[PDB]
Subunit: 326 residues, 2 copies
Amino acid sequence: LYYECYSDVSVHEEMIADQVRTEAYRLGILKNWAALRGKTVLDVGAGTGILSIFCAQAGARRVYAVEASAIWQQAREVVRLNGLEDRVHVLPGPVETVELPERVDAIVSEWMGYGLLHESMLSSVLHARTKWLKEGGLLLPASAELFVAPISDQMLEWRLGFWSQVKQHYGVDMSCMESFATRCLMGHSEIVVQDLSGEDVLARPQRFAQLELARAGLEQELEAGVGGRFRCSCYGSAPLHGFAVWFQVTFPGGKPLVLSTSPLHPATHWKQALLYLNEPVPVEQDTDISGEITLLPSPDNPRRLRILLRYKVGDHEEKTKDFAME
Amino acid sequence: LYYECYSDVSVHEEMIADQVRTEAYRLGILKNWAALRGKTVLDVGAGTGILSIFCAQAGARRVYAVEASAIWQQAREVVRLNGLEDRVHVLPGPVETVELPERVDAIVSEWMGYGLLHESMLSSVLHARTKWLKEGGLLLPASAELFVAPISDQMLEWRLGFWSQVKQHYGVDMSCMESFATRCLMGHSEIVVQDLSGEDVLARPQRFAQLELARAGLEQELEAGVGGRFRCSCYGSAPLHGFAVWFQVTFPGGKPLVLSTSPLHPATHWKQALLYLNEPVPVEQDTDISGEITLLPSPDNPRRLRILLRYKVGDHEEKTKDFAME
Ligand SMILES: [Ca+2]
Ligand SMILES: [Ca+2]
Ligand SMILES: [Ca+2]
Ligand SMILES: [Ca+2]
Ligand SMILES: [Ca+2]
Ligand SMILES: [Ca+2]
Ligand SMILES: [Ca+2]
Ligand SMILES: [Ca+2]
Ligand SMILES: [Ca+2]
Ligand SMILES: [Ca+2]
Ligand SMILES: [Ca+2]
Ligand SMILES: [Ca+2]
């Protein structure tokens, strides 16, 4: 028989094979053994169930693993296989309307999407806190931070310069293709998910927001836009291609465990979210760059990430570019 | 301003950056300097124009570069840049209805698609031979050959076994996910384009068709199906995941130059076309495998590649699986 679960198997494979992600959660949960042991937990967007089993293994008394997608069935199978059907309970459907027998002492979730908030489960986590979390109850992870830096994307640089190098390899000039490749690769308003390294970072990264997940007003702030201003000074001479946005999340310490998606840190499946200018701009050591970044819901889909960028490079005029995920 | 030529720039970048491809054509054209010098050429599906300039550079008197996609405009720019607007002429639109001032002494084309015949220009090349090629005229490349071998795809092997290794890394058993991953990754009828190496080849590759491009009856054979039977004996003990199909093309010698897409040869953007069985089958040294492979047009689209596989492994019954490109 035939199945169309290829894409489905692929994404869960990707998340679990992300050892930075998955080991951070394993360790972050065990860090909170003292506050979990004998306690009840809700896992929002439980997927294949691995995080809920981790909670069990930190000594949680009972875990409710809620998952709306079709993978919920594999999660029940996995729970059973680990001898935990008595303690970890798999409930299909969205957390917004699932009905539990009791309020919980903790919520755990890997809710983060690309650019933190693309197709993320944050709204669901916050709905569940309000509805099902006891007072004094805990959230794992407990906070997030957002960062921006200017970039000189060395791979993009190579793709654009490609056409001018054709002469040197095949003896035909194609340098005229360069303006075209620039229009095609940068002349759009889509957020590009791509992994960079420090070789691409052109100024000290800046934190432009800090979100305490349990704080009053966050659901409203998500609606109106999460972001802030930033200022930085370039390291050296390079083509500025735009900006990169990434995040970290923090687990309580029970020294906090930080899971980072920075290009200066080990790679993760989240990579980074790249915001390209329409064409490269030359910068130099100490060229100043300021601006503002705002993460927003899209008009027809709150879970499709929009990013509004305002930026000023040196003594160029401030400009605006409004981006969205495909 | 914004543009949607990203995908467009990407594919041409890919072809030209394919040095095996592009250098094979450069050399194959120059091999035929004697038959080109002072002669007229038609380049079918000229793209960015690079192959037509190669023909000029082999001393062709005049080259007609015909291209139906939007890239034809960049080709005219590239020709001009190489000082060849007097000799190489860029004509938009499909070759089937383009009107040239004269018949030609040669047709050149990189017409091959994935699996040779997915979204290929072969039908167009054959139409142009009939309509515009002089008698005694030449085609570059002049022939193609198709090959099949059984494979043990080491990357697929790793993906399937992934779930049983989760215990060893995170201390949660997910071996039950394996049946699921198998359904999802192999339980479909899509041709998968993927690059392999000899570490994946499980028996001596077999040639199942040879196409002399200028031969009578080929347009008809393409309609009815190109293919043939094959027999082979496995090297050793491994999970059989299915079969790989690839091709080569040959340029006249003026020792023929062969451009190959075999996994035993240097990588090309064509990679190989993989035909997965619904699940892995154990084989051993000298396990015999026979069958038949046929490349066919799809019912609603002759340029969407269909492959009908009949195969028999050892003393298992012959089976059939009917594949197509997405
Ligand atoms: Ca996630
Ligand atoms: Ca999506
Ligand atoms: Ca990458
Ligand atoms: Ca700040
Ligand atoms: Ca703010
Ligand atoms: Ca300054
Ligand atoms: Ca091609
Ligand atoms: Ca297609
Ligand atoms: Ca590959
Ligand atoms: Ca044969
Ligand atoms: Ca045949
Ligand atoms: Ca035998």
